[model samples]
Target: TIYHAKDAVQATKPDMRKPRLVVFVVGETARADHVSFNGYERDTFPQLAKIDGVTNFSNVTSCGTSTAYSVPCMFSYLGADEYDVDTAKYQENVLDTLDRLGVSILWRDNNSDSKGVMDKLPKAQFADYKSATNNAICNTNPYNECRDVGMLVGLDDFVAANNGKDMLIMLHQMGNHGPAYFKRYDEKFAKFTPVCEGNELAKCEHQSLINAYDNALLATDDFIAQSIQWLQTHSNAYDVSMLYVSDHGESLGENGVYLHGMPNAFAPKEQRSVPAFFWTDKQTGITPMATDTVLTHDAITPTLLKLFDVTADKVKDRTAFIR
Candidate 1:
């Protein structure tokens, strides 16, 4: 059910003066505490922390532990309590909601499971958007996708072509996506020593995994920083903002757990707690909430719509701006 922009043209009649660009970076298997803004000893997110209007949420939870359930649950029309896999109504999604309202959508994926969530948003253009070899490490694991930088190759072209439209662009990062943390980043960025040479996260020592994961975080931070520079350059042509959230958090050998996907009741803070940030150059007059304020993935859609001045009674329960 993937769609390409070739099938449709950017609407010429739409006014470009108030254009809004929403870039949602969906990190795979990232834990909140590991990120620097959350006070991690390592400076993994030095670049992200420096962004002008970035709002980092300290206490946010994901709807589920696995992509199979969490991806749809996050973007569906359900609230936190109702976003269960068994009760999920997948026919409609965030992109569907925007499309029906006449907004354009684009999905740029760096993960292997492109069909997981983007499949539901048929009207939006979908791009595999990565050059890294799939299964680069030759692992048989079903979720082994390439690194997030794989998607950045086509971003310049995509943004150039869609300069002045109210659009929602999703950058699904392979950031710190696991099993092969050593492969996620370049050797120069490897600040932590005593690295783990193994691909199996469970086999690697906790510190080694953290070292590898943090390096990957550094890489992702660089990617986002470059994106912000591009957005800042094009600000006069478009109103752009970027928000990042993980599909589900990962567990780095915590309590004998190597990765995500445990049932909710058993999932640890490493698996349920996620990192979320909102960055913008525009002045969002809404009051910024304290880091302790409860936030969840359900607030993403409504908050995004609000940024575009698109209001709906359905999003009343959702939080907007930094709050």
Candidate 2:
């Protein structure tokens, strides 16, 4: 039977504050262990490192090790332990609850798909980066894969058009997706030398593969920095915020593990430890969880609710999105 969210209402009135804008970025195959903010030896996040007011959570966990599993699970109302696709499909996810409360939501995907998170939303609200027509921006990359920046093409216009409403934009990234890692990023971001250069990950030197992967991260860092800049530019019209969390981490030949998607029971830390953090122009009352406090993808739904100043009984288990 289908479920309902009867209490999803805005906590404050429309004119009580500036209309909010929250950018939620979903990353793919990005591991926290390799990120500089999380104490990696190499500076994989050089661009993001320089941005002020950005809080990089040191330890975080994903709901699953594959995009198909993680994307839907992370955005759903159910926690990882209680989650199952069949039950979730019959109920309202966070987006659905938010829509009922009057938030304007847009999901622009550069990765495979939303994994059914936006199924209830109108087709026009979901923009796929791969199908975006700006060939110069979307089709000029290696493997002819669309650049993540292409998702930003008409965002300014989107914001301008919806000036008076609270907005949420989800940008799903192809971050460090392998084994053809060389094709995931632009050449200008090939800062690391001696990349594996091909999809045969197991045949290449482990260090070269790491370099290619790090370079892809460099590209993501730049993409995020640019997104923050966009949010900052629009801060005048809205109280803006941006949060990034990867769906899962990757195993770069570690302990003989070559990729993600190991069963959760026996999965290595590389496939479970994700990178997560946020930045905002206004006082969101959000802060990082204590080091001892284990953060999971289950925290995302509540976190988003808090960001938009919305409340509901559906997200009752208690993980504050920020503060």
Candidate 3:
């Protein structure tokens, strides 16, 4: 199965490009409706709007409606149609494939679990935010808590150490997760007026709650843009690229729905629909489908496979990792 990708097989293949540094960011409660790149009305993504070479997936849906389910499934090859965490763990999934090929896999999580995705990976490179040994503090909020941005604090040294090696750095974000949306971001991103100031969103005015969510999205925009900028700083070292996809979405009191966890079939568009985008420093010449192109989470693994030159007939027809 490991047919030689004479194309992308090594750090350098004569005239070919260097091996890529892939950053897979998993977001929480990031619905496609709020993202401006997907043809939305709001200027929610001011930072990303200014950046180019980014591919925005217009109609991407999660495999599940909650982080516990969606995050695992997205990283698993079993995918939406046949997702069972137990079975997924036994299979030769994407990360396993990459690891088998000697690519260094670094998983940094601000959230609770990698849903067993990183279960078998070496414990050294995996930082579960609560652990102080990683030098990442888990302050007053809770042991299992840290802003998503904090997840990247140790990345600089990690990247520097992995100089001549390929890396798959997965950042699992605590993005726009709700109830107290106001606290999710600082004052700098509180652009929209009259944010819902409390967690009891049922009592807040619906528009104000929407404003808070939008503001969180604004912060997410800056986080992602800044990530790209970080990659920009390391342009000469690696061919860095990013693919950000939300684990699932949220329901902001639409038709009385407060938060997600409704089953996918019954979940509102807000809960099922998620935002996804791609970025790479080099000109990949990869074209995304129409703006209305609907996709599933399965595209992730195979797409990553393609990135590393695993182009067998067997790895076709999955959700897109990138265009």
Candidate 4:
């Protein structure tokens, strides 16, 4: 076990703190090209576009095309080429380092799971998405999967509970993750018509599949926008910020390839290019936003380190949108 000092990832300035909260959301299978801000004709990002300081990173790459690999790889200090699940299993992730620094860490999952990302963290800190309580409150689709918004349900109480401490809240969403895209959103987000209704994607019309996928992005936009709103409302108590990035992108009937998980060497850009968004209420420290930079999942750990003003000897050294 590699244990770090309690202060290993401490804030840059000791005792110079205001209460802070960073909400980092990990989206499932959200490809970048389809987002409206990134030149997609469909207004999928309507909600996020309206919020000031919500920077839409134009181009970003993923470490892996599948969730099992990308989730842990993105969180570890190890870069993509060197990342090994066995090694990562025993190492301290950015979240663990932040926890050591006395930041309150919470991982809320509305996705299948964190894919072992939170395996070492305190069990109490994870709000179980499989629980009946969460599903009842957030799930409206026939499949009964909890919507991403469910992650926000008890956040106000959580912030109130940890009044004076800095917080790192991670939300893993079930965003646009599949052939069953029609089931990902409520009827209101069904802006595109004639959606593919079943998981058997090949059986559906090509335009119908895209329609379903686009509608799912609309729902993802709503969840992120709502998160930003939540952060804004709590700004008085915490210097709040929100960051959203998809784990990997998806391919929809591109050259007859319907879904993701293509082998890395030959994976299409649709499987690698993912969307990223960031927003902060702080006036200074972050300037000249670099929304056009070519970024990747490799930047996630360093970005978290930069976002929280945290430092650790073992963390990654690259950053994305944040300076």
Candidate 5:
């Protein structure tokens, strides 16, 4: 009952002078090891590579091995080490607190599972977002799958609508959630040869599977890069910034594990390490230009509090990358 705060609570600042639109994308099942920005051999991050002021973290760890546990943990005050669903469901989280603190919050999901993370946030919406860039081809060919870039659709209008308000826009990304990795991207991103072609990923050759995974990485790069581009083009009216972090990493055909959620003790680093990227157009803030290799998802709430100028002692925590 604490979370049904769409209109029940209001956290308004003294005056809505400056607009702060913070986009937090919750990526599903992306492994840190595969991202080119983190030094993978593939040219997967082409669009992202060109984004200025976006600090892509190198060695960040996820709170869990699956979407259910990790997504809530990422949004909770208690991170991976001390997370319990029952306890969390009864307790008001950062979202509820932000709502009370006066930030307009909206959660958009293309992924089938937000793990009930947005259950209480009445403004949360869902849709199967096809490629935001390749909508023409997807419309013609039903064979194509939805792309994360589609999440960007209508956001321009959203920003324009909420002109001078402090808003929190959360995008839950359907990134690299696969056994059918081949479906994650369009032909434009088919850079690697002999990609894995089916849901039964274990049957494919090792390099072939990796090839398909790399394509998903490429697609992820596009989705996020496009988000940055969108923000840059519309920065004139808002003090905007975006941060993308995968809910958990995935294990692609590594030691017979094709997906994630393996026991942590037995799980490989691929399933534990996830990517975190931050981009901002504002000339001055707390975000570091250089990546912080020793970061955890636990800092998320504090970071958001710090990011949007919410410094109330009750919400204070130290994991923020900026301070």
Candidate 6:
């Protein structure tokens, strides 16, 4: 059920001078404890740690165990309990809400599976860069394909064209998504030695895999810091806020489980606990009060509308802001 009144209000021209851009980065299958910000031993998130106005949530949980179910569930209006094939088939998603409200939404995907969330959006961008490695052995291993930096090459062009519009930009990062943790980072970033060649979780030692995954996290940190700088330099008129959240977390040799896709009943902490961070420029004027509030991916859509000062009532069970 689409709300026409809310849609009409969104379509009507509002003050163009208000804050207009929201950058939502959805990280793929990254565990929370592995990141340095969350007290991991490794220096995985150096760049993100230094951000001035960023809010890092210490405790966050995912609704599901796998991306196929979790990602669509997060982006949909149904929240966690209503996530299922039946509900997905019957509902209007966050993209539809933004579209009805006259906001420009763009989906840039780097992962092989878009998880059915991109379908409701009007303009979608897909990069087939990983196609060269489609025949490679690493393709079978999820970790080898989870790369966030690989999508950076085309980001400039996309942002340049959409400058100054009330927009929603979803950057999906393939961070630590993996059987080949060693391959996720550059050779120089290898802080952990004696890594296993095989992608099998049982075969690889837990600490070594974590080292490789940490390096990938380091790369993600660099990417986010650079993205913030790019937005500041390129767009002088719009207030920018960058929010990062993982679709679902991963497992790195935790209790004999090497990767994800475990049933929720048996999901380990590494698979359920995810990392979420938010950063905004000093000029944005919206300050998030510090509190011990629990935040989830489901809160994102409503938060975006609030940030843009758009009035919409169709969003169901959505949290408007994070404390």
User: Which candidate achieves the best lDDT against the true structure?
Assistant: 2
Model 6 whole-model lDDT (C-alpha atoms): 0.66
Candidate 2 — which residues are off by over 4 angstroms? 132-136, 283-292
lDDT of 1 by residue, 99-139 (tens): 66667788777665544556555634876645434223223
Local distance difference test values of all predictions, in order: 0.69, 0.83, 0.74, 0.82, 0.73, 0.66
Q: What's model 6's TM-score? A: 0.85
TM-score of 3: 0.87
lDDT for position 70 in model 4 = 90
Checking candidate 4 for backbone clashes, the offending pairs are none
Clashes of each: 0, 2, 4, 0, 3, 5
Off by over 4 Å in 4: 2-9, 12-15, 314-316
Clashing pairs in 5: 11-101, 11-102, 286-322
**What lDDT, from 0 to 1, does candidate 5 have?**
0.73
For candidate 4, the C-alpha RMSD (Å) to the true structure equals 2.0
Model 2: lDDT equals 0.83
Query: For candidate 5, what is the total of clashing residue pairs?
Result: 3
TM accuracy, model 1: 0.84
List TM-scores for all candidates, in order: 0.84, 0.95, 0.87, 0.94, 0.88, 0.85
- Candidate 1 yields a Cα-based lDDT of 0.69
Q: Considering summed lDDT, which 10 consecutive residues are worst modelled in model 5?
A: 3-12
- Candidate 5 runs further than 4 Å off: 1-17, 123-144, 312-315
Error of 1 at 251 (Å): 1.6
Q: Point out where model 1 deviates above 4 Å.
A: 1-16, 86-89, 114-116, 131-147, 283-288, 321-323
CA lDDT of 155 in candidate 1? 61
TM-score-better candidate, 1 vs 3 = 3
